[PDB]
Amino acid sequence: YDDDDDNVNTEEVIMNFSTPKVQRFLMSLKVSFADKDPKDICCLVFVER
RNA sequence: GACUUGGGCAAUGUGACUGCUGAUCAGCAGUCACAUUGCCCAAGUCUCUU
After folding, report:
1. Rounded to whole angstroms, how far apart are CA atoms A15 and A44?
2. Would the CA dihedral through A41, A24, A16, A47 be positive or negative?
3. Which of A1, A29, A34, A39 is the most buried (most CB within 10 A)?
4. For A49 and B9, how far is CA from C1' in angstroms?
5. Could you say which tissues express the protein in this record?
């Protein structure tokens, strides 16, 4: 209820309802693919389960 | 003991694709008969001609 912009709400909860692992993961995403060519980027995410 | 991956054996189905039969419909072709009025040649009968 501090902010009502659903974009800002989603970003805030993704930033603060999440472990530092996911925070750093998404930060690597944003610093890697901020505004690059969508055709240029082609990446894999490997997880356990 | 969780976690992950892969494979195999099952059954219960679905989605379609062709093959055959029948029916329906659209789509083309080859004809044939035959009234009507015309045209050009062949041979006939007759007026006239003679």
Report:
1. 22
2. positive
3. A29
4. 27
5. In ovary (at protein level).
Technique of determination: cryo-EM
Q: Determine contact, residues A22/A15, Cβ cutoff 8 Å.
A: no
- DSSP state letter for A38: T
Tell me A43's DSSP state.
-
Residues 20-49, chain A: which have Cβ under 7 A from strand B? Answer: 48-49
Q: Give the resolution in Å.
A: 3.7
Start-to-end CA distance of chain A, whole Å, equals 34
Whose tokens are 């805030």? That residue is A12
